[PDB]
Write a protein that binds this ligand. Structure first.
Ligand SMILES: [Zn+2]
Length: 152
């Protein structure tokens, strides 16, 4: 239940999807979300661009959603992973994500936290590509994706 056994060939990106839920000792819930930009195995986001997306979404997601633990790039680079403290709310998360993406598409100022002091690879960034990826998601249109499990 902490990480649904998703069949990646059956989803339709871009989308927002509850990926699992971990219950804490006191009974709180940590909801995990799959914020999918690209269709699995049909292409990937460039490393610099996803690095920039990581920087931008850390703040923009928090501007539109409470309880955010952190927003991380997925190793497969087709989307971002985000854990949130709270019961599952795919609809609410989708709306926050949509708003954060508009903020991202319109981000014409410098990328935050890009320096020797605040970033581990400050030379690896791409605002233009980051902005266009946000635009592409909004153009295509988000939806809440149901998890289709692997029969195994
Ligand atoms: Zn960085």
């Amino acid at each position: 239940v902490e990480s649904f056994d998703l069949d990646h060939t059956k989803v339709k990106a871009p989308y927002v999807r509850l990926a699992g839920v971990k219950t804490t000792p006191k009974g709180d819930q940590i909801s995990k979300y799959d914020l999918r930009f690209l269709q699995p195995n049909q292409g990937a986001i460039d490393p610099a661009a996803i690095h920039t997306l990581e920087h931008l979404l850390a703040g923009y997601m928090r501007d539109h959603l409470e309880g955010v633990v952190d927003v991380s790039p997925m190793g497969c680079r087709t989307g971002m992973y985000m854990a949130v403290i709270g019961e599952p709310d795919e609809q609410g998360v989708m709306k926050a994500f949509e708003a954060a993406l508009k903020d991202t598409a319109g981000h014409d100022q410098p990328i935050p936290g890009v320096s020797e002091l605040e970033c581990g690879n400050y030379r690896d960034h791409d605002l233009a590509a980051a902005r266009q990826h946000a635009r592409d998601v909004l153009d295509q249109g988000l939806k809440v994706q149901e998890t289709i499990l692997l029969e195994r």
